[PDB]
Swiss-Prot record, chains A, B:
CDD domains: GT35_Glycogen_Phosphorylase. One of its GO terms (biological process) is glycogen catabolic process. Allosterically regulated through the non-covalent binding of metabolites, being activated by AMP and inhibited by ATP, ADP, and glucose-6-phosphate. The activity is also controlled by post-translational modifications including phosphorylation. This is Glycogen phosphorylase, muscle form. It comes from Oryctolagus cuniculus (Rabbit). Allosteric enzyme that catalyzes the rate-limiting step in glycogen catabolism, the phosphorolytic cleavage of glycogen to produce glucose-1-phosphate, and plays a central role in maintaining cellular and organismal glucose homeostasis. The gene is PYGM. Homodimer. Homotetramer; to form the enzymatically active phosphorylase A. AMP binds at residues 31, 64, 289-294. It catalyses: [(1->4)-alpha-D-glucosyl](n) + phosphate = [(1->4)-alpha-D-glucosyl](n-1) + alpha-D-glucose 1-phosphate.
Length: 807, 807
C-alpha cells in the first residue's frame, strides 16, 4: 500500500501464506472452521517469528567468532509493549504480511490489536530501556538487555465511579510466542546465610538457594539483519509435611511474580531488594561465564561494559567485587580497578523521594557479605576524600555511603558514583543540576566522571509504526534514509512554504484524529468533536507533573464560557491519562478530580461541544501509539527542575503536535532545536523556583491576587464538582493552599495566558501547520540512535555501525 | 531392524530428517554445534507430534459429525509414563525414526531416556486409567479422559543411608511437547458461599471462583488413525495491599499444584476435596456444553456415559443433580433418572482405610448446596430401602450415606452405588467379595447393578514397547494380529515342544537380563550375576502386599547358606522396589529393613554371588518397562482377599516370568487361564483367612512351632541387621508378633516350601521355559482391550470397532 512498509513480492506472499497455514494446523492444532481471531494472531506471530531465528542464531554466532566488547544493560524494567508490528517493520515484512493476510480473508490490523502489551515497566525509565535496546540493535552493538520476567506486569487500570481500580495484568495467559525458555542455562542465586573467615579468605555459607531460569527474547535491528537478545530471569525453587513443602515453593518463586508499580518513588520493601539482587547475581554469573569462553581479568573491562539503569541494579558493584575477591581470589585493589572500569551509572531523577536508601539491618540479614564489602568500599572511598579535602569533616558525612540517624541506611546512589567510571544525567539541565546540587561533592572530587546523555526515542516505534501516514509523506520528499538517520528531517525546512506539503501534513493529522475519535466510540462509548483542538497530557499521575495545573486551566475555560456563553472560543478536547501507584492517595484523588470535572463539563448544555474533558483509561504503550499521532497540543508542564528529561515530549514533537511547556528537562533542548518562537514556553525557570524557595512559597498570595483562581478554589471547596459529597476534594485544596511542593499557583497566570496564544494560533490552520513543520524538522536530535551512539563512544568505548549482516 | 517396529520407507525417512532439522532450528532455536542430547530429544518429539495432529483434528471432527455416544472417564490420576515411544509404536513410526536418527548420527534409545515420566499417579489405579485410555482409542470409542494437570507428580524417591527421601518431581521444567494449552476453553469453578431459597428455587451465591484451564493431550489408538483426547484441568485465579493480593493468587492455584502421594489409603484433607470438586465441576460443564451442541435431557444418557474411577470423582453425582435441578430447572425425579443412567462406579479395594468418608462440616463449609443434595438423595434412597425391607432398622443405618458418631461423615461409596446404574469390581474374586461383604445390603436391594470387569493391561506398552525381542519371536510364528487381539497368543501352545521356539524364548529372557544387569551398573554402580534367578517384587510398599513375607524368605535363604555353606543352592538376585507414602511410618521402616538385609547379605564372603538383595530405587512406569522384561519370578504375595486385582501380575505373565502367588485378586483368574500346574500357588485362601479371624490370629503360635522363623525374629530383635542401632526394627517385630492384620507368619511355611519348588524347576531350563510358554500363551484374557470391550457392551452401551479412520 505505502512504500515505507516495504515490498509485497509474489514469492514472499506465497511463502507467508503457506507458513501461516502450517502454524495454524501444526502449532495451534486448529482448522479454519473453528479458529478465532486470537488463533489467527498467533499463527501470524509464529510465522513472523520464524523469520527472526536465522538472523538471531547468526548474530550470536557472529559475536562468538569476532568477540567484540559486550554491552550489558541492566534494568529492573523493560516496557516493551507489543512486538508483532515492530518485528515486521524492522524486517521489512509489513506490506507482505498485509497482502498475505488479506488474501486469506483477514484484516492484519485487527489481528495486531489482539496482542497483549509486554508491560514490564511503569513509565519513562522502563520505556527508555526498550527504546535503547532497539537502537543498540540498529547500531550493530553486541548488546544484551538483562532484567526480570515478571509474571504480572503493570496493572490494568479500570475507572469505576471516577476512581482508579487495579486489575492484575495476566499477560502470559495465552502464551508469549516471542520468548524462548532456556532452562538448560539456569543458575543459582544465594540469599541470607552468614560470613565465615578462613586462612584463604571470606566464605558465604548456609545460604538459601533460588534458581534463576532465563527466557530469551529477540531484539531485531532496523533492516540490518542484527538480532540481539533480551534475557529475563524467572525465579524457580530447587527440587530439594511433604505436601506443605511442595506448596511452599511459592515463597522462592514470588521473587519474579510481580512488578512493583511505583513510578519515580522509592519504597524499601524486602521483596524488592530480593528482586534487585536476583537480577544482579544471575546476570553477573552469565557475564563472567561468557567472558571465560573468549585467569586474566585485566582484560575484563576491555570485553565488558555494565550499564546500570538507575540504582536498582547497584548491587552489581559489590557483587562483582565479591566474585572477583572471594571466588577468583584477586586482590582488592585489582578487583576495584576492574569494577570501576566496567560499571557506569545513569541517574534519572533528583527527586529525594525516588532515591534508593536501604536500611542496613535488611542488608545485614539478606546479604551479609555484600554489606561487609560496602563498608570496605566506603572506608577506602572516604580515605580518598579525606586526603583531597583535609579537615573537611562535614564533607565526609555528606559523601559517606552510610547514612547515620535513627536507622542507618546505605545510599545506593553514592555507591554507584564511587564504583563507576562514568555517571550521566539524561538531559543537559538535569546533568547540570546533578553537578550543582545533589552530587556536587562527588563532582568536586572526580569531575571527569560526570557526563550528559540527553534521552531519545526510537523513530521506528514512534513514527514509522504508529504514524505510517506521516512517515510516508516525509519519505515522498526526502526518501527513507531518515528512519535510521533522523537528523535528515532537517531537509523538511525546505518545504515550510510548500503548499502541497502543508496540506499533506494537515491531512495526516486530521486522519489520525478521525481514527482516534472513532476508536474512543468503539471501545469506550464516548463521542468527541474531531475538529476541536486535541489537548493531551499523558504520563504517570504525579504531583510534580502537575496534572492539577492542567485541571485549573480546564476549569478556567469552563468558567469563562459560563460567563460569556455566546462568545466564540476555539473548541478543545482535553484528554488526560495515566496510572497512579496503588498507594499514592493524592494521585488517586487527582484522577477522581479529572473525571469529576468531566462529569460537569461534558453534560452542561451551554458548553455544547466547545469543551470536552476525557480521562483516557489504562494508558500504556499501545494506547500511546494511538493517541500521540492524534494530538495537536502536548502538555509538558512539570515544575522547572523536577522532570529529569521526559520522553513523551519527544514522541509528540515527532508526530506533529506543538508543545506547551516549562523550561524543564529535555523541553529546554527541544525549544533550542526548534527555536523558542516555535514552542509555547511559560512559567518559572529553575532560577525562579530557587528564588521563591528562598523567600518562602506562600500560595495564599496568589489566591488573594487572582480572582479567577479564587473562584476555582471556592468551587472545589464548596462541592461544585461533588454535589452529593461536598468536601470530597478538601485534601487537594488543603495541599494547594498550604503544602504544595510544586508551586501550582505560581505558574497559573502565565500558563493561562500562554494557552490563549495556543488558541489564537490554532485559529490560523496554515500558520499552525507551518510551526508544526518546524518542530518535526528539528526533532532529529531526539532519536535514541543519537543517544546510544554517544553512550557507545563516550562511555562504553565501542564504535557503532550501520553495516548489514548477511541474511 | 525388526518387523513389528514397522517400515523404514525411503521417502518417510527423508521427510523425518528434514522435519527434525526444521524443529531444531525454528522450534528450539539451536544449531547442531551447540545442541545437547535433550535438544535432540525435543526435536524428535516435535517431529513425531506433527504426525499426530492431522489424525487428532480429523478424529474430533469425525465425532462432531457422527455424534456417537461419548464416554467420559473421570480420574484423579493418569499414570502415563513416557509418550515418545508409545506414540511411534501406535503410528508405526519406530523403525523409520530409528533410521532417520541413525542417519543424523544419533542413537534413538539414548534420546528416549531423556523424556520425563508423566507421573500423574501413584500406582495401580492411576496406571489402569492410562491403559484404559490406550484401549479405548484402539477400539475406536469416542472417549475422553478427564483429570487434573498436577504441576508436581509422584515424588522422586532417593535412598539415603537406606532410608527413603522425597524430592519434588518437577516434570514440566523443560516443557511438555505433548500437551496443548486451551486457555480459550477456561471455565469457572465455585467454592464456599451459601444457599438461598426463592420462588424459583435454590441458588448458590457469594462463592469464591477458581478458573479451570484445560490442557489437551493426544491419545493415539494402535494403527487405526484414531486420536482421542485426555483433558487435564489447571487451576488459575481470576484477574480481579496490591502486591499481597497478586501474591495471594497462589492460594487458588494450589489446587492443581501437587498429586497427593497416597496409595490405597484415605486422608480427609480439605485441599484434596477441592481437587475432587475442581475436576468434577469443570468436567461436567464441558460435558453439558458438548451435549448442547449436538432443552431435552431425556436423551442425555443416550449420548453420555460417565465412568467414576473409584469414589474420587463421586461429587459428579450431586453436581449433575445440582446443574439439572438448580440451573436447567428439571424436576428432581427426572434429573435423578438421567443421573443414574449416566453414571457408573468402579470400586478398586475393600480395605476399610481406603474408603472415602468426608466429614459433614467440611462439605457444609466448602460445598453447602451439594450437602443439601446429598441429604435429599439419602432420604429418598432410605425410603426405598424401608419399603423393600420393612422394619429392618439396622439395615437403614448400615445403608445410609450419612454415618453417625462423634463426627458425622458422608460415605462416598454409598453415594456412588445409589447414584449409578452399574457398580463393578476389578477381578472375579473381588466382585464376589463386594456382594458378600461390604456392599451386601446394596446387592440385596439392587442385584442388577453389580458386575465384574476383570482388569487388564495394554499389550502395546507392556509387550511391544518394553519387550520388542519377545514381540518379534512371537510375530515370526503367528504374525502381528495378536497385538490388537491378544487371545491369538493361544496359538503359541502349538510350539511348547518346538525346540527352536524354546531356545528363542530363553534367549530373549537372557538378553533382557543382561541389558538390565548393565543398566544397574551404569546408573546405580551395582553389580549382579546375570545367570541367577531374577526374583522381583515391584509395587507400592504396603503391609497388605507383604514385602515383609518376601524379606523373611530372603533371611531364611541367607541363614540356610550360613548353616551349610558348601551345599549348592540355585543363585538368586532378589529385587524389591516401590515407593512408600511420605507419612506411612511402617512402610518406610520396611524399606530400611530391605536395604539393611542387603548390607549384610551382599557383603558376606561366604554367600558369594549365590544371593544378592537389591532395593530398586524410584520405581515408576519407565523402570517397570525395564525390570519386568528381565524378571524370572513375579512375587504376587498379598494376603488372600486384600489385593482387589493387581495389574503388575499381568505385566509379568505377558513378559515370560513365572508367578509365585496367593489366590488373591486376578492371580486366581491367571492360574485358571494357564492351569494351576503352571503357577506357583501357596498359602491361605480367603476362606482360610476368615476361619483364622474367627478363632483369633495368634502369631506367637507360629513363632513357637517354627525354629527357622524364631531365629529370624531373634536376629531382628537383637540387632543382627542393625549393629550400631540394635533396637531399630523393634516396631516391625512388635507388629509381626502382636498386631499383624495381614497374617505374615501364617503363610510363611507354605511360602518357603513353594519357593523351594521354584528353585527346583529353575535347575531344569527346558522345563522352566516350557512352563513360561504356557503362561505367555494364556495371557490373552488380560488385555485391557478385552476389559474395555466388556465395559463398552455391558455398562456404556456402545460397540467397539477395529476399523481404521482414513489418514
Ligand atoms: O524507587 C523505585 C522503586 C522502589 C521500590 C519498588 C519499585 C520501584 N520502582 C521504581 C521505578 C522508577 C523509579 N525511578 C524513576 C526515575 C526516573 N524516571 C524517569 O526516567 C525517564 C528516563 O530517563 C525520564 O525521562 C523522566 O524524566 C524520569 O522521571 C522514572 O520513570 N522512574 C524508581 C523506583
Ligand atoms: O483415598 C485416597 C486418597 C485420599 C487422599 C489423597 C489422595 C488419595 N489417593 C488415593 C489413591 C488411590 C486410592 N485407592 C486405590 C484403590 C485401589 N488401588 C488398586 O487399584 C488397581 C486397579 O484396579 C488394582 O489392580 C489394585 O488391586 C488396587 O489395590 C489403588 O491403586 N488405589 C485411594 C486414595
Ligand atoms: C513515553 C512513555 C512514558 C513517559 O512519558 P513522560 O511524559 O516522559 O513521563 C510513560 N508511559 C508510556 C506508556 C510511554 O510510552
Ligand atoms: C502396574 C504398575 C503398578 C501396579 O502394580 P501392582 O503390583 O498391581 O500393585 C504400580 N506402579 C507402576 C509404576 C506400574 O507400572
Amino acid at each position: 500500500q505505502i512504500s515505507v512498509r516495504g515490498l509485497a513480492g509474489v514469492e514472499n506472499v506465497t511463502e507467508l501464506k503457506k507458513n501461516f497455514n502450517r502454524h495454524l494446523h501444526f502449532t495451534l492444532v486448529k482448522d479454519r472452521n473453528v479458529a478465532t481471531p486470537r488463533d489467527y494472531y498467533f499463527a501470524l506471530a509464529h510465522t513472523v517469528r520464524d523469520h527472526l531465528v536465522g538472523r538471531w542464531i547468526r548474530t550470536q554466532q557472529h559475536y562468538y567468532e569476532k568477540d567484540p566488547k559486550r554491552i550489558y544493560y541492566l534494568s529492573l524494567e523493560f516496557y516493551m509493549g507489543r512486538t508483532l508490528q515492530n518485528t515486521m517493520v524492522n524486517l521489512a515484512l509489513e506490506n507482505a504480511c498485509d497482502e498475505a493476510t488479506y488474501q486469506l480473508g483477514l484484516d492484519m490490523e485487527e489481528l495486531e490489536e489482539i496482542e497483549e502489551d509486554a508491560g514490564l515497566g511503569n513509565g519513562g525509565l522502563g520505556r527508555l530501556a526498550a527504546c535503547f535496546l532497539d537502537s543498540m540493535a540498529t547500531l550493530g552493538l553486541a548488546a544484551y538487555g538483562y532484567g526480570i520476567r515478571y509474571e504480572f506486569g503493570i496493572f490494568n487500570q479500570k475507572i469505576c465511579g471516577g476512581w482508579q481500580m487495579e486489575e492484575a495484568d495476566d499477560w502470559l495467559r495465552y502464551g508469549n510466542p516471542w520468548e524462548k525458555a532456556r532452562p538448560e542455562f539456569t543458575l543459582p542465586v544465594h540469599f541470607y546465610g552468614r560470613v565465615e573467615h578462613t586462612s584463604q579468605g571470606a566464605k558465604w555459607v548456609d545460604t538459601q538457594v533460588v534458581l534463576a531460569m532465563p527466557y530469551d527474547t529477540p531484539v531485531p535491528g532496523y533492516r540490518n539483519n542484527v538480532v540481539n537478545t533480551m534475557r529475563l530471569w524467572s525465579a524457580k525453587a530447587p527440587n530439594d509435611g511433604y505436601i506443605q513443602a511442595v506448596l511452599d515453593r511459592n515463597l522462592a518463586e514470588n521473587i519474579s511474580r510481580v512488578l512493583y508499580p511505583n513510578d519515580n518513588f522509592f519504597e524499601g520493601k524486602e521483596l524488592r531488594l530480593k528482586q534487585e539482587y536476583f537480577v544482579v547475581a544471575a546476570t553477573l554469573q552469565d557475564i563472567i561465564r561468557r567472558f571465560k569462553s573468549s585467569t586474566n581479568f585485566d582484560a575484563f573491562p576491555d570485553k565488558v561494559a555494565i550499564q546500570l539503569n538507575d540504582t536498582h541494579p547497584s548491587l552489581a558493584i559489590p557483587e562483582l567485587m565479591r566474585v572477583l575477591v572471594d571466588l577468583e581470589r584477586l586482590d582488592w585493589d585489582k578487583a576495584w580497578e576492574v569494577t570501576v572500569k566496567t560499571c557506569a551509572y545513569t541517574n534519572h531523577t533528583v527527586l529525594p523521594e525516588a532515591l534508593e536508601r536501604w536500611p542496613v539491618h535488611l542488608l545485614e540479614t539478606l546479604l551479609p557479605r555484600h554489606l561487609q564489602i560496602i563498608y570496605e568500599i566506603n572506608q577506602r572511598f572516604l580515605n580518598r576524600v579525606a586526603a583531597a579535602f583535609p579537615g573537611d569533616v562535614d564533607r565526609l558525612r555528606r559523601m559517606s555511603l552510610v547514612e547515620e540517624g535513627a536507622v542507618k541506611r546505605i545510599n545506593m546512589a553514592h555507591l554507584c558514583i564511587a564504583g563507576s567510571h562514568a555517571v550521566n544525567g539524561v538531559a543537559r539541565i538535569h546533568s547540570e543540576i546533578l553537578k550543582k546540587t545533589i552530587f556536587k561533592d562527588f563532582y568536586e572530587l572526580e569531575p571527569h566522571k560526570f557526563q550528559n546523555k540527553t534521552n531519545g526515542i526510537t523513530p521506528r516505534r514512534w513514527l514509522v509504526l504508529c504514524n505510517p501516514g506521516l512517515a510516508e509523506i516525509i519519505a515522498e520528499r526526502i526518501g527513507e534514509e531518515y528512519i535510521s538517520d533522523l537528523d535528515q528531517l532537517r531537509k523538511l525546512l525546505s518545504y515550510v512554504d510548500d503548499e502541497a506539503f502543508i496540506r499533506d501534513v494537515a491531512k495526516v493529522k486530521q486522519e489520525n484524529k478521525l481514527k482516534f475519535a472513532a476508536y474512543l466510540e468503539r471501545e469506550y462509548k464516548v463521542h468527541i468533536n474531531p475538529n476541536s483542538l486535541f489537548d493531551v497530557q499523558v504520563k504517570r499521575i504525579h504531583e510534580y507533573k502537575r496534572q492539577l495545573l492542567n485541571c485549573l486551566h480546564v476549569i478556567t475555560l469552563y468558567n469563562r464560557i459560563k460567563k460569556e456563553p455566546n462568545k466564540f472560543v476555539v473548541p478543545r478536547t482535553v484528554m488526560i491519562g495515566g496510572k497512579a501507584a496503588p498507594g499514592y492517595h493524592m494521585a488517586k484523588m487527582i484522577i477522581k478530580l479529572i473525571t469529576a470535572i468531566g462529569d460537569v463539563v461534558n453534560h452542561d448544555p451551554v458548553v455544547g461541544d466547545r469543551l470536552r474533558v476525557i480521562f483516557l483509561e489504562n494508558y500504556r504503550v499501545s494506547l500511546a501509539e494511538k493517541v500521540i499521532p492524534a494530538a495537536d497540543l502536548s502538555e509538558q508542564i512539570s515544575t522547572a527542575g523536577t522532570e529529569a528529561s521526559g520522553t513523551g515530549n519527544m514522541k509528540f514533537m515527532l508526530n506533529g503536535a506543538l508543545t506547551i511547556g516549562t523550561m524543564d528537562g529535555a523541553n529546554v533542548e527541544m525549544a533550542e532545536e526548534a527555536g523558542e518562537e516555535n514552542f509555547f514556553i511559560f512559567g518559572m525557570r529553575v532560577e525562579d523556583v530557587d528564588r521563591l524557595d528562598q523567600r518562602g512559597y506562600n500560595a495564599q498570595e496568589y489566591y488573594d491576587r487572582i480572582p479567577e483562581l479564587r473562584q476555582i478554589i471556592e468551587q472545589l471547596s464548596s462541592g461544585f464538582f461533588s454535589p452529593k459529597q461536598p468536601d470530597l476534594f478538601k485534601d487537594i485544596v488543603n495541599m494547594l493552599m498550604h503544602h504544595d511542593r510544586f508551586k501550582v499557583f505560581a505558574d497559573y497566570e502565565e500558563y493561562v495566558k500562554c494557552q490563549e496564544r495556543v488558541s489564537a494560533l490554532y485559529k490560523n490552520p496554515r500558520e499552525w501547520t507551518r510551526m508544526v513543520i518546524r518542530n518535526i524538522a528539528t526533532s532529529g536530535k531526539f532519536s535514541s540512535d543519537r543517544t546510544i551512539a554517544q553512550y557507545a563512544r563516550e562511555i562504553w568505548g565501542v564504535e557503532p555501525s550501520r553495516q548489514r549482516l548477511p541474511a
